[PDB]
Amino acid sequence: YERFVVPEGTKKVSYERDTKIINAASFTIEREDHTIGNIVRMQLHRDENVLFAGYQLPHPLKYKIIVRIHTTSQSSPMQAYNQAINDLDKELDFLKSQFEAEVAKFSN
Amino acid sequence: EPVTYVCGDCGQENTLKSGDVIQCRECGYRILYKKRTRRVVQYEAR
Amino acid sequence: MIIPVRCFTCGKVIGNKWDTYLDLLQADYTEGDALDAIGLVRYCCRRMLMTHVDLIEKLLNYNT
Amino acid sequence: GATYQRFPKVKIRELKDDYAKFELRDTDVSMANALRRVMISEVPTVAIDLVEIEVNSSVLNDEFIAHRLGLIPLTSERAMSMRFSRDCDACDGDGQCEFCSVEFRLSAKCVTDQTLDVTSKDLYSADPTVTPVDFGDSSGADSSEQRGIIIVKLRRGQELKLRAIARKGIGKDHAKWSPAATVTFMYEPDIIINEDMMDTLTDDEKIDLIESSPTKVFDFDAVTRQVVVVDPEAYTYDEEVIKKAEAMGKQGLIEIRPKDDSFIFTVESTGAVKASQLVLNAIDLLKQKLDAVRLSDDTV
Amino acid sequence: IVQKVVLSSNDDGKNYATVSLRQVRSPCLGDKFSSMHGQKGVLGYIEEQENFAFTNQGI
Ligand SMILES: [Zn+2]
Ligand SMILES: [Zn+2]
Ligand SMILES: [Zn+2]
Known part of the structure; x- marks a missing residue:
């Protein structure tokens, strides 16, 4: 119904460049929960040039995430954000490969 | 269908007409339920 | 009234296990041995079978 | 674009039509929790x-x-x-x-x-x-x-x-649409039981503090008078054994530490979907959700 | 939803009419509950399943 995926007239992800601090932005993601925000922030903490990775829900009844990234120079929020998403996608590839391998050892 | 009212202890369909004294014929008891006709009804399994 | 499908806490389907539960208690088993025979390991389902009140029979007798 | 990528491992203990158990390791807790929450609420x-x-x-x-x-x-x-x-x-x-x-x-x-x-x-x-x-x-x-x-x-x-x-x-x-009916995981412990404190205390105290465990984790090897961990995966993190070691005042005797990796799953199913099909549909829906949230269109 | 219609009367013809409606309610966010020990409350927050704390059996 309307609780699920974002209707027409609103983006899925809305970017916002923070004003008062250099190397700082706030990614306001629609239609999510702790599932994606948690794995995104814990992938961000394994990076070198990142400084601050968190998410919070502006009301616990409403179904959206706001993520914040403070980074150093030699990078940006955009670079480390897309680095996080792509490396999580690669790990899900390698995990699906391992699981479909291990299913085959129940050989029928 | 007509109204087709059902008695309480007879079980017989009197098929009542315009307002008399409420009293089941073939007897004297005065219960007179109303029969459910054959319709459709919509429900959400929730 | 009838046994509920889907044990309220976890979600295992228990809606078919009622008559075999009555038969296992009918034979000679106690309730722990019966629930271990049907294979219900967590207590969220055991509390759902041991405390069920079956009221459909009293309704079937009082209709006509 | 550096590496920044950890390499999981799967090894299955049991697998039937509506059951599984596999020793997922070298991945973080949040990934395992993501798999759990997708299998409980996201898989159709x-x-x-x-x-x-x-x-x-x-x-x-x-x-x-x-x-x-x-x-x-x-x-x-x-x-x-x-x-x-x-x-x-x-x-x-x-x-x-x-x-x-x-x-x-x-x-x-x-x-x-x-x-x-x-x-x-x-x-x-x-x-x-x-x-x-x-x-x-x-x-x-x-x-x-x-x-x-x-x-x-x-x-x-x-x-x-x-x-x-x-x-x-x-x-x-x-x-009514949730196909899970049990999805859970747990850590697995690292138990580093000392042998130079265990030979100090007496045999009745040995058979006492083995007895205080509510699950059979340890075993008493009477032939060498020693104790033995025989099942780490039945430890349930309630500290009663180390608490009775504290009340007996023998510190440094046993220590128990949950490892950071090594998440033993246990997946059941209502029978609408097989178990391995649930895991693979979970990985695919996580890839679809990670796909639909990229800002790759405008780099700057 | 209408459940039944009952039409009775009295000795001096005083015709009586009875209509029963039916409803199904799930407990909403304002309802009151209690234990067996005089410890009552109001349901204030209905929470989805995967956010509760779970034991090693998954309860
Ligand atoms: Zn169609
Ligand atoms: Zn009559
Ligand atoms: Zn259960």
Whole structure:
């Protein structure tokens, strides 16, 4: 119904460049929960040039995430954000490969 | 269908007409339920 | 009234296990041995079978 | 674009049609929790979603019967390729369709004096052999009772004619679509029991502090007078053993540390979907969700 | 939803009419509950399943 995926007239992800601090932005993601925000922030903490990775829900009844990234120079929020998403996608590839391998050892 | 009212202890369909004294014929008891006709009804399994 | 499908806490389907539960208690088993025979390991389902009140029979007798 | 990528490992202990256990390691806790939450609430399943009752003359009511029909599990192996019925161009006729909206039928009546009960095996499905009612709890498994899920019981002048329409949904809309019925994981402990403190204290104290454990974790090897961890995976993190070691004042005796990796899953299923199919659909829906949130279009 | 219609009367013809409606309610966010020990409350927050704390059996 309307609780699920974002209707027409609103983006899925809305970017916002923070004003008062250099190397700082706030990614306001629609239609999510702790599932994606948690794995995104814990992938961000394994990076070198990142400084601050968190998410919070502006009301616990409403179904959206706001993520914040403070980074150093030699990078940006955009670079480390897309680095996080792509490396999580690669790990899900390698995990699906391992699981479909291990299913085959129940050989029928 | 007509109204087709059902008695309480007879079980017989009197098929009542315009307002008399409420009293089941073939007897004297005065219960007179109303029969459910054959319709459709919509429900959400929730 | 009838046994509920889907044990309220976890979600295992228990809606078919009622008559075999009555038969296992009918034979000679106690309730722990019966629930271990049907294979219900967590207590969220055991509390759902041991405390069920079956009221459909009293309704079937009082209709006509 | 550096590496920034950790390499998981899977090793399966047991695997049956509706059960699994695998020792996932070298991944973080949040990934395991993501797999758990997707398998409980995100993976879709076909279930009954609409009921038209033509005749009902039993002692139960309409919403009770519709509520029991909503919870009967249907086999959902074409549900990943079906579509949400709000997203279908066709099928605006409250009936059968081919990408959603399987239609069912049910009629039963008793003319004997033997108290006929209406079970799940009286639901006859149009669009057959793809979404029937589930039978694995009856046949192919000698678990409890082949009669299946009882819906109503009836007498002579009693009948029940209806027509149900199944659809597609996920567990966040209602509990009837969640195919999990158990999804959980746990850590696994690192137990580093000292041997130069264990030979100090006496044999009655040995057999006492082994006895204080509520699960059989340790074992008493009487032939060498020593103790032995025989099952780490039954430790439940309640500290009663180390608390009695504290009350006995022998510190540095045993220490127990949960390892950062090594997440032992335990996956069950209602029988609508197989277990390995649940894990693979979870990984695929995580990839679809990670796909739909990229800002790759505008780099600057 | 209408459940039944009952039409009775009295000795001096005083015709009586009875109509019963039916409803199904799930407990909403304002309802009151209690234990067996005089410890009552109001349901204030209905929470989805995967956010509760779970034990090693998954309860
Ligand atoms: Zn009469
Ligand atoms: Zn359970
Ligand atoms: Zn359609």
